[PDB]
Design an enzyme around this catalytic site. Sequence first.
Site, PDB file in Angstrom:
ATOM      1  N   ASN A 160      -9.957 -11.727   3.565  1.00 30.74           N
ATOM      2  CA  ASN A 160      -8.513 -11.790   3.739  1.00 30.74           C
ATOM      3  C   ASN A 160      -8.178 -12.311   5.132  1.00 30.74           C
ATOM      4  O   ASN A 160      -9.005 -12.293   6.050  1.00 30.74           O
ATOM      5  CB  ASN A 160      -7.874 -10.413   3.540  1.00 30.74           C
ATOM      6  N   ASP A 175      -1.911   6.539  -5.932  1.00 27.95           N
ATOM      7  CA  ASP A 175      -1.346   6.686  -4.595  1.00 27.95           C
ATOM      8  C   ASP A 175       0.143   6.364  -4.525  1.00 27.95           C
ATOM      9  O   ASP A 175       0.703   6.334  -3.422  1.00 27.95           O
ATOM     10  CB  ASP A 175      -2.129   5.822  -3.594  1.00 27.95           C
ATOM     11  N   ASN A 202     -10.223  -3.303  -1.205  1.00 23.38           N
ATOM     12  CA  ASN A 202     -10.030  -3.847   0.138  1.00 23.38           C
ATOM     13  C   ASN A 202     -10.574  -2.909   1.209  1.00 23.38           C
ATOM     14  O   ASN A 202     -10.266  -1.715   1.215  1.00 23.38           O
ATOM     15  CB  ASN A 202      -8.532  -4.086   0.358  1.00 23.38           C
ATOM     16  N   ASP A 235     -12.405  -8.028   0.331  1.00 24.50           N
ATOM     17  CA  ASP A 235     -12.263  -7.426  -0.994  1.00 24.50           C
ATOM     18  C   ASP A 235     -13.605  -7.470  -1.717  1.00 24.50           C
ATOM     19  O   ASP A 235     -14.288  -8.499  -1.701  1.00 24.50           O
ATOM     20  CB  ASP A 235     -11.229  -8.171  -1.842  1.00 24.50           C
ATOM     21  N   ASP A 257      -6.407 -11.085   7.485  1.00 25.75           N
ATOM     22  CA  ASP A 257      -6.439 -10.118   8.575  1.00 25.75           C
ATOM     23  C   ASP A 257      -7.851  -9.684   8.946  1.00 25.75           C
ATOM     24  O   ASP A 257      -8.004  -8.807   9.806  1.00 25.75           O
ATOM     25  CB  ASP A 257      -5.593  -8.892   8.215  1.00 25.75           C
ATOM     26  N   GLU A 311      -9.216 -10.709 -11.071  1.00 24.51           N
ATOM     27  CA  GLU A 311      -9.642 -10.377  -9.720  1.00 24.51           C
ATOM     28  C   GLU A 311     -11.037 -10.914  -9.424  1.00 24.51           C
ATOM     29  O   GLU A 311     -11.284 -11.436  -8.331  1.00 24.51           O
ATOM     30  CB  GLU A 311      -9.610  -8.862  -9.508  1.00 24.51           C
ATOM     31  N   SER A 353     -10.111  -8.304   6.848  1.00 19.68           N
ATOM     32  CA  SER A 353     -10.657  -7.404   5.855  1.00 19.68           C
ATOM     33  C   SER A 353     -11.272  -8.211   4.714  1.00 19.68           C
ATOM     34  O   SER A 353     -11.109  -9.432   4.624  1.00 19.68           O
ATOM     35  CB  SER A 353      -9.578  -6.463   5.330  1.00 19.68           C
TER      36      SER A 353
END
Length: 129
Positions: A46, A101, A59, A52, A48, A35, A50
């Site tokens: 990203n 989650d 994110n 990281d 969209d 990562e 956003s």
Amino acid sequence: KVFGRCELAAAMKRHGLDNYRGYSLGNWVCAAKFESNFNTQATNRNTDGSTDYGILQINSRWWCNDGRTPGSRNLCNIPCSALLSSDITASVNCAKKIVSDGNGMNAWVAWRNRCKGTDVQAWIRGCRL
Ligand SMILES: [Cl-]
Ligand SMILES: [Cl-]
Ligand SMILES: [Cl-]
Ligand SMILES: [Cl-]
Ligand SMILES: [Cl-]
Ligand code: NA
């Protein structure tokens, strides 16, 4: 801060990630390698809009606030900049919420494509833990 492999393994173990939700320590070191290349200051944008952040590339669409991701959530209740610190505490505590989650470590695309199903124990081989 750019961690060494065994340095990061020991820090993640002290913070309770070894076998957290059933994921052995090597899974977490492998995810961090691919990562961020073990670099706490890593950022990536990203499509969209956003971004990281940090050693585990968390994110801003869901997990932290960076003031520039409209309509996003802040489920770890932290500014995203806190995930870039040389102290990995904030990143680890947020990652614990993510992995709990429902989807496990599949949330990390690099883990799913480069670590899942491999001999992840090799990532902590030789380390004093
Ligand atoms: Cl390495
Ligand atoms: Cl392991
Ligand atoms: Cl925002
Ligand atoms: Cl620490
Ligand atoms: Cl799981
Ligand atoms: Na956000």
